[PDB]
Amino acid sequence: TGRPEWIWLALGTALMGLGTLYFLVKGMGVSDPDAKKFYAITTLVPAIAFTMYLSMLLGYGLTMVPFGGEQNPIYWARYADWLFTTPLLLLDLALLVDADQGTILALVGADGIMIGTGLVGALTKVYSYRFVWWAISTAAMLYILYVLFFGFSMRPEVASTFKVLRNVTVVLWSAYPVVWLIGSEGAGIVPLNIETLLFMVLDVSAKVGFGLILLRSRAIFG
Amino acid sequence: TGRPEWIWLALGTALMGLGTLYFLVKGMGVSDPDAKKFYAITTLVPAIAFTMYLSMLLGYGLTMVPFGGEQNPIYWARYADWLFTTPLLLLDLALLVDADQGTILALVGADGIMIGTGLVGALTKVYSYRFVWWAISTAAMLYILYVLFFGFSMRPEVASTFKVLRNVTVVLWSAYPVVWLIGSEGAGIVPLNIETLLFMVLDVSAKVGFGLILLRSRAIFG
Amino acid sequence: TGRPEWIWLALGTALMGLGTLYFLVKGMGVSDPDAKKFYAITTLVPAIAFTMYLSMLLGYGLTMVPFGGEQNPIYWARYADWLFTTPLLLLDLALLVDADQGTILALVGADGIMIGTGLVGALTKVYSYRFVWWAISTAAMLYILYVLFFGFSMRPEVASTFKVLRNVTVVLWSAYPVVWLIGSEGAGIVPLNIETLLFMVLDVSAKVGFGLILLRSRAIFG
Ligand SMILES: CC(C)CCC[C@@H](C)CCC[C@@H](C)CCC[C@@H](C)CCO[C@H]1OC[C@@H](O)[C@@H](O)[C@H]1O
Ligand SMILES: CC(C)CCC[C@@H](C)CCC[C@@H](C)CCC[C@@H](C)CCO[C@H]1OC[C@@H](O)[C@@H](O)[C@H]1O
Ligand SMILES: CC(C)CCC[C@@H](C)CCC[C@@H](C)CCC[C@@H](C)CCO[C@H]1OC[C@@H](O)[C@@H](O)[C@H]1O
Ligand SMILES: *C/C=C(C)/C=C/C=C(C)/C=C/C1=C(C)CCCC1(C)C
Ligand SMILES: *C/C=C(C)/C=C/C=C(C)/C=C/C1=C(C)CCCC1(C)C
Ligand SMILES: *C/C=C(C)/C=C/C=C(C)/C=C/C1=C(C)CCCC1(C)C
Numbered sequence: 001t002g003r004p005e006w007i008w009l010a011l012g013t014a015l016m017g018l019g020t021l022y023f024l025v026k027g028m029g030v031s032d033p034d035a036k037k038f039y040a041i042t043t044l045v046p047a048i049a050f051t052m053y054l055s056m057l058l059g060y061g062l063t064m065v066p067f068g069g070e071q072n073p074i075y076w077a078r079y080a081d082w083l084f085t086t087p088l089l090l091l092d093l094a095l096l097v098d099a100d101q102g103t104i105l106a107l108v109g110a111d112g113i114m115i116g117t118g119l120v121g122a123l124t125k126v127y128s129y130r131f132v133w134w135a136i137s138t139a140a141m142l143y144i145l146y147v148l149f150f151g152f153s154m155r156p157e158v159a160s161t162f163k164v165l166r167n168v169t170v171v172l173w174s175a176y177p178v179v180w181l182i183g184s185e186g187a188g189i190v191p192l193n194i195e196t197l198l199f200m201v202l203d204v205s206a207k208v209g210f211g212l213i214l215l216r217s218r219a220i221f222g
Numbered sequence: 223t224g225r226p227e228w229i230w231l232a233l234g235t236a237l238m239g240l241g242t243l244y245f246l247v248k249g250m251g252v253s254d255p256d257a258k259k260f261y262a263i264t265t266l267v268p269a270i271a272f273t274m275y276l277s278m279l280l281g282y283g284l285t286m287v288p289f290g291g292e293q294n295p296i297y298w299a300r301y302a303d304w305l306f307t308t309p310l311l312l313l314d315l316a317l318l319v320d321a322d323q324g325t326i327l328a329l330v331g332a333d334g335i336m337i338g339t340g341l342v343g344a345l346t347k348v349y350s351y352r353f354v355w356w357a358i359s360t361a362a363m364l365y366i367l368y369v370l371f372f373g374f375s376m377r378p379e380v381a382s383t384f385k386v387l388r389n390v391t392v393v394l395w396s397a398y399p400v401v402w403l404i405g406s407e408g409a410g411i412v413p414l415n416i417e418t419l420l421f422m423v424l425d426v427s428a429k430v431g432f433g434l435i436l437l438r439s440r441a442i443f444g
Numbered sequence: 445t446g447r448p449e450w451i452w453l454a455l456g457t458a459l460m461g462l463g464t465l466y467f468l469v470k471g472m473g474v475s476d477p478d479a480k481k482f483y484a485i486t487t488l489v490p491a492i493a494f495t496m497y498l499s500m501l502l503g504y505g506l507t508m509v510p511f512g513g514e515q516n517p518i519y520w521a522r523y524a525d526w527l528f529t530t531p532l533l534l535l536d537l538a539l540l541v542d543a544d545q546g547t548i549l550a551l552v553g554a555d556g557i558m559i560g561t562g563l564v565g566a567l568t569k570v571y572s573y574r575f576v577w578w579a580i581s582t583a584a585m586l587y588i589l590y591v592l593f594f595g596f597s598m599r600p601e602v603a604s605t606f607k608v609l610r611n612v613t614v615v616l617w618s619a620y621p622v623v624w625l626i627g628s629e630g631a632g633i634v635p636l637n638i639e640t641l642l643f644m645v646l647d648v649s650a651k652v653g654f655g656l657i658l659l660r661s662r663a664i665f666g
Contacts, residue, residue: 033322033323037323047332048331051335058348060345105481106484109492113492255545259544261546263549270553276576281570
């Protein structure tokens, strides 16, 4: 509790943990191979998130980066979380609409670039350059959003759940580059405790909130 | 030869190397696509292991971690080995029984969490926390063991080889958290040379020993 | 522009960037699922390369390694590029000839070992050992070349484009271990600026040059 942001990291940890356990119990019994796929993907997401929230809470996922003539606290563990979780979440949307492998690779490759360049931006020591990396990560984000709207016989429950989950994704994901820009990785207008609060609300909605909508749907069943 | 554990790292290196070459020569000629799969997976495992044993032997895969008021030698390269090899080994079991993709992802995701949290525990500088990570890695291990027994028309040679390899896995894998807890990553009761000896016997049995049983079986052929 | 090699890193960055945009525009409209696969793979390659060239140009992808009694500049970001791009390129060849999954895994696993051991060699602080890692990476390279010639009903356009792209691969890839050995990672005969020039010509040919030949071919269409 030395750092003011501990509370939001604690709550993130708890909520990802409880979400994972909920999904895990909910997907017991599931015999449908397609349903198993969606549960496996959607439960793994908050499982990984739990581990990386814990790491930040305990101090392990935090590093100091010198820039602006300061030693800046950067939580590097978010990118380790997002490196795996954001593609799994895109895979959830991809499988729902029976995407072509070529489209799956494009989403996943663009997403790896999004998070990888975002990470490089987070750890870059020349201040002006950090925003060069932010711009590149955002171009990759915009690509991903474009494919979700314009890149994809489909059952009506699948169509309907996809349109909901796609709208949840556009709104929530588009917010991340904004928090990063105004927070302590970027311009440093909003302090880290508030930034951490913003990412915890964003992540819990994008993982547990997303997963509740998906796993309650008939779309996950063949 | 400055460090007493060099011998076991040398022998591990030799034995993984010779195993890889044996499997490589054994899988020449193989035309059956299913058989190719099992050889590719089972030969890659000791190939990666060879590289990471060499790295520890040469000094590259070793790092000092400060905890307990000591500078502790931690061989970080084991987790780089296991990050890739333990899933490949689970993939061997998964393909043998024609597992659903949802089950394959669950095993592989749980295994990534097992090794990733194990790594974080290995490098953590607050002593009490290291065992928080050990506990979490063990929960993920227990999950994996559960799926192998309760998560899975099957040919009798496949059934029979699976039950052998599953029993080899349960016995050998369950030993790793024990060695780690009592060794120099954990409570520091057993010294590092003996710990290194325990992991070399464990790894060689779990990779080369496992691979001998699998690759001698008729189960690998469609 | 403090370091003489900046020019080649700038030009590499520009050329990978323009290549990516060219491929991206060229693969708009593509409805054929097989064609989408090849574009997704072949566009992702210079996309990742662009990011890692930029990182070297900006200073981020550079590190000092002490060996020979010097502080040696090693561009570590090449291996982060190649870790993902060389397998994707092998996947391009693999899918062209309808390779068995067992062969795909062997190529990809051998390639991961090639680049991983190459990375360990690049960062190793005992000079003589660096070349132990170089030897091991080269054995893995030779394995890969062997499979491409001896490891693989096939349409004649596919046969023909494969033989072209395979010859482009053998010639270009075999050059990398040579540049590394005589450059600043190895014996230090050729200085870093010239070495950087050699890798930029090699990478642009192997990614954009390769991709031009592949994406202009009828082989990519089912
Ligand atoms: C010991 C304490 C510190 C408690 C913390 C442990 C917990 C919060 C985090 C551990 C998560 C991880 C080890 C378990 C997640 C397993 C996922 C791979 C579950 C995927 O499950 C689906 O895939 C199989 C499908 O058939 C479907 O039924 C799902 O259950
Ligand atoms: C130069 C010395 C230092 C000797 C050390 C080299 C050696 C011990 C380690 C190198 C291992 C690696 C480069 C070769 C392993 C290749 C695997 C991918 C083999 C997979 O093989 C199967 O997959 C193809 C299948 O069709 C089946 O036939 C198998 O052979
Ligand atoms: C803002 C500036 C700094 C400009 C730099 C951005 C640019 C050079 C690098 C960004 C690359 C990345 C974000 C976009 C690459 C997307 C690939 C995944 C494209 C794969 O495209 C294929 O896959 C889908 C298929 O259907 C086929 O049509 C292809 O288009
Ligand atoms: C569960 C976590 C999720 C869904 C995280 C999503 C994160 C992003 C869409 C982040 C995007 C960013 C950019 C577009 C610019 C650079 C900074 C990032 C990584 C925050
Ligand atoms: C070839 C290597 C194998 C089969 C290694 C298996 C390793 C494990 C099952 C390790 C498990 C661990 C825990 C359950 C707790 C934390 C420490 C570990 C990683 C040793
Ligand atoms: C786009 C980049 C490509 C096609 C890079 C290919 C790189 C190699 C084939 C590198 C091979 C090396 C060895 C065989 C020995 C050790 C050093 C390396 C990694 C340069």
